[PDB]
Amino acid sequence: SMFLPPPECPVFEPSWEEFADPFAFIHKIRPIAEQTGICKVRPPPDWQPPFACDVDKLHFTPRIQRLNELEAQTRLKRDYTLRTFGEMADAFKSDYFNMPVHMVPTELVEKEFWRLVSTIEEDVTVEYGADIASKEFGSGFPVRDIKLSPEEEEYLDSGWNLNNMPVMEQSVLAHITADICGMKLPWLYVGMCFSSFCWHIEDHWSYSINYLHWGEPKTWYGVPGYAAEQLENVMKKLAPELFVSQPDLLHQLVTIMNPNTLMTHEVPVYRTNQCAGEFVITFPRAYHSGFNQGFNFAEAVNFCTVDWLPLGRQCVEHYRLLHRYCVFSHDEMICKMASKADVLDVVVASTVQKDMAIMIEDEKALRETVRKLGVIDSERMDFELLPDDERQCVKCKTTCFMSAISCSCKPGLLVCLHHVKELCSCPPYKYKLRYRYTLDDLYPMMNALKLRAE
Ligand SMILES: NC(=S)Nc1ccncc1
Numbered sequence: 347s348m349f350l351p352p353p354e355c356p357v358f359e360p361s362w363e364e365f366a367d368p369f370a371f372i373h374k375i376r377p378i379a380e381q382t383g384i385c386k387v388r389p390p391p392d393w394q395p396p397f398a399c400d401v402d403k404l405h406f407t408p409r410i411q412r413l414n415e416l417e418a419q420t421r422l423k424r425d426y427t428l429r430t431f432g433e434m435a436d437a438f439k440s441d442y443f444n445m446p447v448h449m450v451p452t453e454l455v456e457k458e459f460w461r462l463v464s465t466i467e468e469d470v471t472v473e474y475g476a477d478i479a480s481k482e483f484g485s486g487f488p489v490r491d492i493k494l495s496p497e498e499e500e501y502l503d504s505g506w507n508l509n510n511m512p513v514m515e516q517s518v519l520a521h522i523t524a525d526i527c528g529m530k531l532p533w534l535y536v537g538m539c540f541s542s543f544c545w546h547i548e549d550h551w552s553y554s555i556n557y558l559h560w561g562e563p564k565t566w567y568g569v570p571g572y573a574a575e576q577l578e579n580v581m582k583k584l585a586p587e588l589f590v591s592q593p594d595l596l597h598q599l600v601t602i603m604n605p606n607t608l609m610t611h612e613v614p615v616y617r618t619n620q621c622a623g624e625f626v627i628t629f630p631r632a633y634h635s636g637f638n639q640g641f642n643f644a645e646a647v648n649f650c651t652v653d654w655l656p657l658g659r660q661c662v663e664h665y666r667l668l669h670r671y672c673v674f675s676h677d678e679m680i681c682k683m684a685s686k687a688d689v690l691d692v693v694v695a696s697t698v699q700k701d702m703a704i705m706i707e708d709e710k711a712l713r714e715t716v717r718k719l720g721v722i723d724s725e726r727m728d729f730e731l732l733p734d735d736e737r738q739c740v741k742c743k744t745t746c747f748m749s750a751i752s753c754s755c756k757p758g759l760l761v762c763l764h765h766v767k768e769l770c771s772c773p774p775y776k777y778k779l780r781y782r783y784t785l786d787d788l789y790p791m792m793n794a795l796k797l798r799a800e
C-alpha cells in the first residue's frame with residue numbers, strides 16, 4: 347500500500363555438473379533470465395570458498411551518501427579498518443530500529459528504505475566502501491602470491507572465482523590489450539544498512555556478476571534489457587536534470603527511484619534478496635539498483651560472452667547518437683581477435699567472423715561516402731598507439747580505430763567518418779583520410795577466422 351514489492355526474479359540451483367562451466371550454464375539460463383534482467387544463482391552446497399582476512403589490517407577510504415529519491419549522484423571512480431567500519435555500521439542499524447540487527451525483518455528494512463528516501467524532512471546519510479582490488483585491500487577470493495592451504499587451491503582456478511573470469515577464453519573482453527582496469531578488474535564493496543547503488547546499466551552493455559562473501563543480505567531491483575528505453579523515458583519526465591550532457595565518463599549522473607513508480611508506468615521490475623554465498627547476474631542493458639540490509643562484503647566483475655558481440659556494436663552506435671564517451675574501441679577489439687585467429691576457441695572464431703563481416707561492409711560504405719565529399723588524400727595510421735583522449739571524434743566523442751578525417755589546419759584533431767562536415771572550414775581537398783587497414787588487408791583477416799571456425 348505504501349510499498350508493494352515487485353515479483354521475485356528467477357533463482358537457479360545448478361548441479362555440480364551444470365556448475366562446472368560458468369559460461370555454458372549462463373548460456374543455458376539465458377532465455378529465462380534475460381526476460382527479467384537479473385537472476386540469482388545458488389552454488390552447490392559444498393562449494394564454499396574460504397573467506398579469510400584480518401579485519402584490522404584492511405584499510406579503506408569511506409564514501410558518503412545522502413538518501414533522497416530523484417536526487418542526482420555521480421558514479422564512482424577519513425579512514426576505516428574493516429573492524430571500525432563494522433562497529434560503526436552495526437551501531438547505526440541497532441540504534442535506528444532500537445533492536446538487535448538479526449531481528450530486524452528484511453521486509454521492514456525495505457519498506458523503511460523507500461519511506462525514508464521519499465520524505466524530504468529526513469536527512470539520513472550513510473557511508474560505504476567501493477574500490478578495485480589493491481595492496482591495502484585485495485580480492486576476497488584466493489589469489490596466487492604467501493602459501494595457500496589445500497582448500498584455497500581447490501578454488502584458485504574456479505571459473506566462479508571472479509579474478510579468473512575476466513581472463514577466460516569463452517569471454518571476449520580478456521584479449522583486449524588496452525588497459526581498462528575499471529572494467530575487467532573486480533570491484534570490492536563494503537555495505538551498511540541503507541547504503542545504496544543507483545539505477546544504471548554497465549558500460550558497453552556488458553554482463554556483470556556479483557558475489558556476496560559474507561554479512562547481511564543485499565536487496566536488488568532489475569529491469570529486462572528490452573525495457574531499457576521505456577525506463578529512460580520515465581526517468582526523463584520525472585528527473586530531466588540527469589540527462590544534461592556531460593564532459594566526462596567520470597561525471598555520469600544517476601539516481602534512486604521507487605520501483606513502484608516504474609511499475610505504474612508499465613515498466614516490468616523484479617526483485618531479490620541476495621544472501622551470503624549467493625551470486626547475482628545482470629544481463630546486457632538490464633537496468634538495476636538496490637541497497638544493503640546491513641554490514642556486508644561483496645565482489646563484482648564485468649564480462650562479455652560471444653552472445654554479446656552484436657549488442658556491443660549496437661551500444662557503440664547508441665553512444666555515438668548520444669555523444670557519450672566509450673571505454674574502449676569495439677572495432678579494435680574485433681581486429682585484435684582476428685589477428686589471433688589461430689589460437690581462438692572455434693565458437694568464438696565463428697561469432698567474431700560474423701561481426702567482422704558487418705564491420706567491413708559498414709566501413710566500405712562510409713569510405714565511399716567521404717570520397718564523394720571530395721576527400722582524396724589518404725595515409726595509413728596506427729590508431730591503437732594513440733592515447734584514447736587523442737583519438738575521439740570532436741563531434742560525437744567516439745573512439746576512432748578503423749578510420750578518421752584530419753586536417754593540417756587543426757593539428758591533432760579528428761572526426762569519425764559520420765562527422766566529416768564538423769572538423770573545420772577548409773575545403774575537403776585539404777582533408778586526409780587516416781585508416782588502419784585497406785579493404786584488401788581486411789578480407790584475409792576475416793578468412794583466417796572462417797578457417798579456424800571450419
Ligand atoms: N554496493 C554495490 S553491490 N554496488 C553495485 C554497484 C553497481 N552495480 C551493482 C552493485
Ligand SMILES: [Cl-]
Nearest residue numbers: 462463465468
Ligand atoms: Cl530524504
Ligand SMILES: [Mn+2]
Nearest residue numbers: 546547548554
Ligand atoms: Mn552494476
Ligand SMILES: [Zn+2]
Nearest residue numbers: 739742762765
Ligand atoms: Zn563522430
Ligand SMILES: [Zn+2]
Nearest residue numbers: 753755770772
Ligand atoms: Zn582545416
